[PDB]
Structure formats: C-alpha cells, structure tokens
C-alpha cells in the first residue's frame, strides 16, 4: 500500500516510463494521479507544511494538462481533477504560475463540460485565484456566448 | 415541449444527468457492453433560479402508475386489490410489528396474481418479432438503472 | 370472573378478547381493546389482573369483577411492545419494546424509582426472565442475545449467528436448559449457568435441532421442563424431549388441499399444570387444545372474527 | 405503424366499425401507386360507397382519402380526370361542412 | 437469472474498472457548498463518510468491511436484500410493494 | 342557549373519563443508588432447589 | 353457410392447389361477409390478389363470429387438417397470422385440440423460421406445468434467436429449481 516508503519508489517508475515512450495517455496519466494521490496522504498526516505539498502540487498539475491534450474527447476525469487542485491549492504563486500557461496551452473547447463546476465557484474569496475564473470565462464568452 | 417546473430545486437533477453522460461513455468504449446496446436513457434539464427549472418533454412515454391502471380498469379490476385484502385480514396494518406484516403481505400476494405488466407489453405489440424485441430491451435497461441507481443510493422509486 | 382454577383468554386482530375455560367451549367474558392489536398477554402472579400490552400502551384489564374497560394503562413508550412479564413475587414488571429498549416498570405507588432502561442497537423480539429472578434475557433483530444481569450493570452479549433475527427464548423453571429460535427455524439450545449461587452467567453451545424449514415464531418449555414446544410459520407446531432431543409429537393443522396455501401460521403453544395437554392458537381465527399423546384436538374455541396471535394459559400451582 | 396497427385492432376498435378502417387503409395503399393505374378507376367507384353507407361517421376518414386523392387527379391524366372530378363532387356531398 | 443478471454483472466490472473516473464527478457534487445544504440533515463531516460509503460499494467492501467480495458474489447479494418479504412489507403504501 | 348545550356536554363525557388509571414514564431511576441497587432490584432469590412431583391434579376436574 | 365447400375440398395435394385454395377461400370470405364495408372490396379482390390477402384476417372473424356452435366446429376440424397437411411456408404464414389476430381479439383466441393448440402452432412455426412466434408458445407451455423437454426446447429456440444470455438463464433454473443429476450432458 501507499506508504511513506513506497510512494517514492513509485515516482521513480512512472517518471522514468513517461520519457522512455511520450505523447502516451496511460503514462502521463498514471504519473500525475500518482501524484494527486501522494498530497492527499500527506494531508491526512498532518492534520491529526507550504514546502511539503509543493513539491507534489505543482507536478501534479502539469501532468494534467499534458495527459488532457493526448485525450480529445475522453477528458472528463482530466479536466476536473485539475478543478480540484486549482480550487484548494490555487492560492499559491508557485500553482498560478502553472496554472496560466496551463489554460492557454490547452484549447478553449475543454472547458464546456466543466462550466456548471466553474459557475459554482465565481465567488471564492481569494482574489489571486478569483481573477482567474473570470478571465476564463470571458474566453468563452468569446468564441461560445451560446452556452454561457 | 418543456415542463416548467416551480418551488423545486433542479440544480442536483442537472449534475446527475452529466453523471449519467459519463457513464454512457463508459459502455460505449466496452466491447462487451456497446454490443448488449447498453444506455441510459436523458432528458435536458435547464434550471433557471433557486426554486425553478425548466425539464424537457420526453414523447411516447408514459408513466407505471397509469400504464398499470389502465389496463385494470379495461378488465374490470379494481385498482387497489392487493390493498383492499391486508386491510380486510388485518385493519390496523400500519401499527403491525414486523413479523405480522410479513404474514398479512405474503397472504395477499399469494391470493392474487401478479402478471398484469406481462400481459400489457404483449396487448400493445401488433407482432410477435416486435414483441420479443421490445421485451429484450426493457431487461437490460431496468438492469442497468438498478446498478447505476445503486451507485448513486436513488431512493423513492415509486 | 377469573374466580375459576383454571383460566384461559385469547386476543387478536378482533380488538377484544375472549374469556374461555378448558371444561367446556363456552365463552364468558368479551372485553375491549380499541384501536390496536394485542401482541403478547400474560396475567400477574396474584391471578387477580390480568396485561395485554400492543402499539405504546401496556392497558390492564380486571378479572375479579366485570370490567370491559382498560381500568389501569401505561404509556411514555413510542413504538410497540413485544412481550410483557412480571416478578414471581409481583413487584416490577418487565417489558421489552421495540423501540430498542427492554425497560423494567415498577408497581409500587411511591416515588421508589425502581425502574431500569437497557439501551441497544436494534430493536428486540423476545425478553424472558431467570428462574431466579435474578438475571434477565433480551434479544433484538440482528440475532445477538444478550444476557442482562439484575445484580450488576453488565450485559454479555452472545451471537450464534448473524443476519438472521430471533424471535423467542425461553428458560424452564426448572433451569436445565436455555433455548431460542431464529427466522430461519434453528433451535438453538445452551446449557445454562451453573454459578446459581453468585450468577456467574456462563453459558455452552450443547446442542442445534434442525427443524421447522419455513419462520420459527414461538418456543417455550413445559413446567416440568421435560417437553419442548417450538411454533412455526409452516403450520406445524413440533414437541422435543430434554433427554436426546427426539421429536416427541409433531402437531400440524394442515388441510392438506393446495387451494388454502398457508390459510394461517401457527404463533403460540402454552403447557397445563401437568404438561398433559397443550393449548395453540392459529391465525386461523380460532384456538386448538391439543394433546401430546393421542394428537387428536380435545377442544376448539372460534368466537373470534379475526386472526389471534396471543393466548394466555395458567392455573394453579398443583398439578 | 399506425397502418400495421390498424391491421390487428390494438385500439379495441369494435367490430361495428373496425371492417370500414381495415378496408380503407386496404383500398388506399393500391391508390399511392402509379404502377396500378389501371385500377385506379374501379378503386374510387368503392371509396364513394363506404361514405355513402357510412353517413356521418366517415369523416375521421377524410384525412387518410384527401391527402392522396387530390395528389391523383394532379399527376394521372387522360379520361380518367374527368371521371374523378365527378367523383370527387359526390365526396363532397356527403362530407358538408368538414371539407374544410 | 438470465439475461437481468447476466446484464448487472457487466455492468459492475465496468464500474469496478473505471472507479476514479466516476468517483471524480461525485467529489465534485458532494464537496460543492451551495449544493450539499439539502444532504446535511464538523460541517464536512458528513460529507466524508457519504464518499466512503461509495468507495466501500465500488470495491465490494459494503455488506463486510473485513472482506473484498468479487462481482458475482455481490450481485448475487444485493438481489435476495431487494426481493426479501421483510424488507418490502416495511416499505411504505405509496410506494406499492405488492406490485 | 348554545354554550350551553356544549358546557353540559363536555360534563357528561367526563364523568366516564375519570375510570381509568394512567401511569406515564417519567426519565427517572436510581442512578445515584449505584451501591443500593443491590437490594432494590437485585434480590436474587436463589431458592427452590428441591423438585415437587405432580399427580396430574391440574386436569383432574377439568376432564 | 357456403365457406363449409371451401374448406371442405380434400383434393388439394399440390402446391399449386394449395394456393389456389387459399384464394378460392379468401375471395369467398369476402362474398358473404354481413358487412356492406366488406363486400365492396369483393369486385377489387378478384382483379387485384394480393389486396384480398391483407383482408383474410378481417373477414375470417366477421362470419365466423355469425355461425353458431355446430357451424363454427367444422371450421376448426378443417384449419387443424389444413395445418397438418402441407410443408408450404407461405400458406402456413397466412393461417399463423390468423391465429395471432384472434388471440388480441377481446372474444380470445379460437379453440384448438388442446389449450386452444398451443403444441400445434408451437411445432408448427419452427420450421417456418418464425422463432418469434415459436417461443411465445412454448413460454405458455411452461406456465402450465414446467417439464425436462419444455426447458430443452427453450436452450434450443434462443440459441438460433442470438440470445446466449436468455439461454444460460434456462440452464440455471433446472439447476437449482428442478432435480439434480438430471440435466442431460447435451
């Protein structure tokens, strides 16, 4: 099982099977689940550090967004674990970095599925991650005013 | 056709109906599933405020309550049978205890036969090869409800 | 008037209860009972007031007089009551609920607060008493019997098996052998605690009679605790014998037609003062008394319009 | 499906006037073919007596005759367009006030 | 048990097989603040055991947490709970249990 | 009058009211008498050990 | 009071005969129908066959609805003989027809030897390759009274009907519902 030993050990696999064979769904998606799932072990540890959870957050969010760009039409999972992360984690200057060049790099037509998600969290009061929904939005509003 | 809907709350209607979207596409990817021709059946659901919504109108479909009393009323049946025999053996049937109202429900499920969907299918099919096509239909799609339901913990299905 | 011997009453779906004797099928007395059914009837060792208690109410009926009214009546309690006892010397009385609670109500009119309440997780189908009045057997739905003890405020708790609900359990006066029945038909029998001076409340796994395929409903000794009586929902009711568990009688009312189709269960058995005759009452809407030797019926009672699932037989101590 | 409907009864129709719907449907699927053009003239010399011995309850038949009907006398010619219109005159006189 | 249970059995491996995808959507539904008001009846509590209850039924650890029940085995358990005459004589009269 | 009528009317019904003895459950034990429940239902009368026969007299004058 | 010489013919031995009975008994139907809707077509019928075999099932329940008990009795003696006699699919499919015409019909389905004929039809339609019909019959069969050779047949119906699951479920009911060691190895 997960434990503090053999979450390591499983990186070491998964990134190593990522470069070996690239521009592979089942490799970039089972390193960056991997690491969604390492930050959530960590979590339930110390509640019974920024440091601690930073080095798997960030990863965590960059294997998303390649593994949803090598999906097209079967990203439902993708694009909603990366909501989670964004939503939680977001607040950070080392998650929006990523987060930015995340939304452009992938294309506008991803976002559609998870608009009632998006709408259920205009008003966050954090105004780092805040300003951010509203960007994304307008986007939309752009090309598909429609569905908006 | 829509169904304007008021003093009801459709914003968790509209988040299982995209739960029932990704399970679609989960049989449709299975090859021993997309060849059962396995699906959930969907309406459009749009809400608009709090408390209102708008659902659309699905055709060619009726309801079980109706079908059933339809087809009771035609044959001189009285809709509410089954009923009528647990009240008359025992008339404080609510206040039973639990092991006298398994006496009571089994009793009158024994006087009385219950085949009346069995029947109705047949009555509404004007051929034998659309019957049978019909009636297979209808045992994988209560099947998959019954599992995707149990998931889901869906309860009053009345 | 219950100034007789020998007394006997029959309670049901009707909403009264009749009043019969064992000398003759006449009836004498009909009482009411509004707006519920009896589950479980049984009269106080004085013989002088008898108790039906079903759906939040435990009503009191006079026997000395001709009362058709519930003199005397209780509530406080939510859901309904599966069985009532009281203390051989008539000082508390006993009631478990099944709102999950096996209560103890007591019967002196002063602020004595002799009362206990016994909490568990589901709700409970039989309660009985010690033969020494001093420990008490409770048990619920989930097939998990528990052992409540009078002098402390521990209760073991002992499950055969689970998933399957019990539904009665009895002790012989004689205190030889502890029995109980689940919904499937399985008796299992427990040699009882051989501590009798401090309660060490020991209990072994001595034997397990496969019988009664369908529902076990109702099992209970004899006074002599040389028989065994367990009902069934297949309409047939069987005797066992304490030395190697041998059916000694087997008792069915079955028409053999299959037109009827389970036309009544059989819910109830109760023993004479010698263990002779046994007296049954049916869903069928009337009460057999029976005998463990020829099997013949002695007697029929059917001044009943609904079904009665609860008798009450007791007589003298002689016998 | 509705025509294939019609053909086992499914509504419960009585017998009183189930033969005049199942003879209909009958005559009108030799009426929507211009291969039988041949039979075209006998064909509508029964149509005008079902609702001549029908009476009045023949008009729930007017939306299955006209539709095809009129689409007839617009393609078929010769002599037989002239003895449709005298056809079609005696249609109406039964049919008053639900032409329409 | 013909083509029903044939048809129920496919159905969990397919959900067995694919258990993040569809508990990824139920995160999203129970944890949402303005959509959880009606399923309260700590504030977060509930909603976690409400996550783990599905998890249990997606790994067949619901019936007995101490063992892992495979697909035919728990099919074959949730059909006698719902055709029992004890559970359904308790069921309300709306509800029609007879029919 | 009206009133009236209903004033008689509720006493007539009364009297019949007052027949029955209630006792309700009131959330209250022993609970400070954790030592001296041992005595007040706990008496545990431990007795009749020796065995009494029977000469079916219990039936004798029923049949 | 003339159909009884149109059925009752007993000459027809070739195929050829056999179809122009059946024409011989429709346009006759038609005659004599009690119904002025029906008689109209008669003229029609005869220049144009096949718009008088779609009319078979609604003439045939017009007269026989009229004849008494005795008159109606030869014709079942009669249809029993005819489904009995010839292998021809297209003859058989016409009197198939009729039968289920009747059995949706509120007066029920017309008598038979036994249980309005349900065996007969039963066999009757499996060499047609109208497995549609064939298995509604024999799920009647087995209402009645469930037997080794019913569930046999059933395992054999669905497998040329492409349904290997509804076969399976057959196999499980004699396994648990029905005597062990029985199942025969085929």
């Known amino acids: 099982g997960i434990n503090e030993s053999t979450i390591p050990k499983v990186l070491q696999y998964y990134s190593a099977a990522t470069e070996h064979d690239r521009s592979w769904y089942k490799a970039w998606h089972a390193w960056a689940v991997m690491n969604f799932e390492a930050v959530l072990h960590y979590k339930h540890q110390n509640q019974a550090l920024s440091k601690t959870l930073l080095m798997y957050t960030v990863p965590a969010v960059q294997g998303f967004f390649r593994s949803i760009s090598l999906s097209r039409g079967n990203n439902l999972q993708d694009t909603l674990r990366v909501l989670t992360l964004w939503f939680d984690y977001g607040h950070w200057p080392d998650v929006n970095e990523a987060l930015v060049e995340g939304v452009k790099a992938i294309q506008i037509d991803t976002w559609l599925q998870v608009i009632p998600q998006l709408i259920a969290r205009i008003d966050t009061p954090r105004p780092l991650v805040g300003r951010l929904i509203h960007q994304l939005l307008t986007d939309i509003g752009r090309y598909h005013p429609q569905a908006l | 056709v829509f169904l304007l809907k008021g003093h009801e709350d459709l914003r968790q209607d509209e988040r299982v109906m995209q739960l029932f979207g990704l399970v679609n596409t989960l049989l449709a990817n299975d090859p021993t599933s997309l060849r059962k021709n396995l699906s959930i059946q969907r309406y459009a659901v749009i809400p608009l405020s709090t408390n209102s919504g708008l659902i659309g109108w699905v055709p060619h479909c009726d309801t079980l309550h109706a079908l059933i009393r339809d087809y009771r009323e035609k044959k001189k049946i009285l809709l509410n049978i089954e009923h009528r025999i647990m009240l008359r053996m025992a008339p404080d049937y609510d206040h039973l205890t639990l092991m006298q109202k398994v006496e009571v429900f089994e009793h009158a499920v024994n006087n009385t036969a219950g085949d009346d969907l069995a029947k109705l299918l047949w009555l509404k099919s004007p051929s034998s090869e659309v019957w049978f096509d019909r009636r297979t239909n209808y045992t994988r799609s209560l099947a998959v409800m019954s599992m995707v339901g149990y998931i889901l913990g869906l309860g009053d299905r009345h | 008037v219950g100034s007789d011997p020998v007394i006997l009453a029959t309670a049901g779906y009707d909403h009264t209860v009749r009043f019969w004797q064992a000398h003759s099928g006449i009836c004498t007395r009909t009482v009411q009972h ?186 209970r000794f004899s006074p002599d605790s040389t028989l065994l009586a367990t009902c069934s929902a297949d309409q047939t009711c069987k005797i066992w014998r304490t030395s190697n568990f041998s059916l000694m009688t087997e008792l069915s009312i079955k028409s053999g037609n299959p037109g009827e189709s389970s036309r009544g269960w059989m819910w109830g058995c109760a023993f004479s003062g010698d263990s002779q005759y046994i007296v049954t009452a049916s869903s069928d809407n009337l009460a057999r008394l029976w005998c463990v030797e020829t099997g013949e019926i002695k007697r029929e009672y059917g001044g009943h319009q609904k079904a009665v699932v609860c008798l009450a037989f007791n007589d003298s101590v002689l016998g | 499906y509705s025509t294939s409907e019609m053909l086992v009864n499914m509504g419960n129709l009585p017998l009183d006037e189930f033969y005049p719907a199942v003879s209909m449907v009958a005559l009108m699927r030799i009426f929507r073919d211009q291969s039988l053009s041949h039979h075209h003239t006998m064909v509508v010399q029964a149509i005008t007596f079902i609702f001549k011995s029908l009476g009045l309850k023949c008009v729930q038949f007017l939306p299955q005759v006209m539709p095809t009907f009129l689409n007839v006398i617009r393609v078929c010619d010769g002599a037989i367009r002239e003895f449709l219109f005298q056809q079609l005159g005696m249609l109406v006189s039964f049919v008053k006030s639900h032409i329409r | 048990d013909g083509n029903y249970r044939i048809t129920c059995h496919t159905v969990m491996e397919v959900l067995r097989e694919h258990k993040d995808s569809v508990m990824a959507v139920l995160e999203a539904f129970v944890y949402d603040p303005l959509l959880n008001w009606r399923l309260m009846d700590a504030l977060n509590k509930k909603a976690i055991q409400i996550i783990n209850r599905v998890r249990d039924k997606l790994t067949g650890r619901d019936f007995s947490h101490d063992d892992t029940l495979d697909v035919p085995t728990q099919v074959e358990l949730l059909i006698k709970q719902a055709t029992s005459h004890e559970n359904l004589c308790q069921c309300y009269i709306g509800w029609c249990p007879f029919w | 009058s009206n009133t009236a009528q209903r004033l008689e009317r509720l006493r007539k019904e009364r009297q019949n009211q007052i027949k029955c003895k209630n006792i309700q459950w009131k959330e209250r034990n022993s609970k400070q008498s954790a030592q001296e429940l041992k005595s007040l239902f706990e008496k545990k009368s431990l007795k009749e050990k020796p065995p009494i026969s029977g000469k079916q007299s219990i039936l004798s004058v029923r049949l | 009071i003339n159909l009884q010489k149109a059925w009752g013919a007993a000459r027809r031995v070739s195929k050829d005969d056999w179809l122009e009975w059946l024409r011989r008994l429709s346009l006759e139907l038609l005659k004599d129908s009690s119904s002025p809707s029906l008689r109209s077509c008669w003229a029609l019928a005869q220049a144009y066959n096949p718009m008088a075999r779609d009319l078979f099932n609604a003439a045939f329940v017009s007269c026989w609805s009229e004849l008494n008990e005795d008159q109606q009795d030869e014709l079942i003696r009669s249809i029993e003989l005819a489904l009995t006699s010839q292998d021809i699919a297209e003859v058989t499919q016409t009197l198939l027809n009729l039968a289920e015409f009747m059995e949706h019909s509120d007066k029920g389905p017309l008598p038979l030897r036994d249980d309005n004929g349900i065996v007969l039809l039963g066999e009757r339609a499996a060499k047609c390759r109208a497995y549609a019909k064939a298995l509604h019959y024999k799920e009647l069969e087995f209402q009645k009274g469930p037997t080794p050779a019913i569930l046999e047949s059933l395992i054999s119906i669905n497998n040329k009907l492409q349904q290997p699951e509804a076969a399976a479920g057959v196999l499980e009911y004699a396994m648990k519902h029905f005597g062990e060691l029985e199942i025969q190895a085929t």
């Open chain 3, 34 to 219: 509004q707006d519920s059914q009896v589950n479980a009837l049984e009269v106080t060792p004085d013989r002088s007031m008898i108790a039906a208690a079903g759906y939040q109410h435990i009503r009191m009926y006079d026997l000395n007089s001709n009362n058709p009214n519930p003199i005397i009546s209780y509530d406080g309690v939510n859901k309904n009551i599966a069985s009532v006892g009281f203390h051989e010397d008539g000082r508390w009385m006993y009631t478990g609920g099944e709102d999950c609670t096996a209560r103890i109500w007591d019967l002196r009119s002063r602020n004595l607060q002799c009362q206990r309440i016994f909490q568990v997780n589901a709700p409970i189908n039989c309660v009985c008493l010690h033969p020494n009045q001093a420990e008490l057997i409770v048990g619920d739905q989930s097939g998990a019997i528990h052992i409540w003890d009078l002098k402390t405020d521990h209760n073991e708790q002992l499950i055969p098996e689970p998933e399957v609900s019990i539904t009665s359990a009895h002790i012989d006066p004689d205190a030889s052998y502890m029995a109980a029945v689940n919904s499937t038909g399985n008796c299992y029998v427990w040699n009882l605690t051989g501590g009798i001076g401090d309660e060490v409340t020991q209990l072994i796994p001595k034997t397990k009679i496969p019988a009664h395929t369908r529902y076990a409903l109702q099992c």
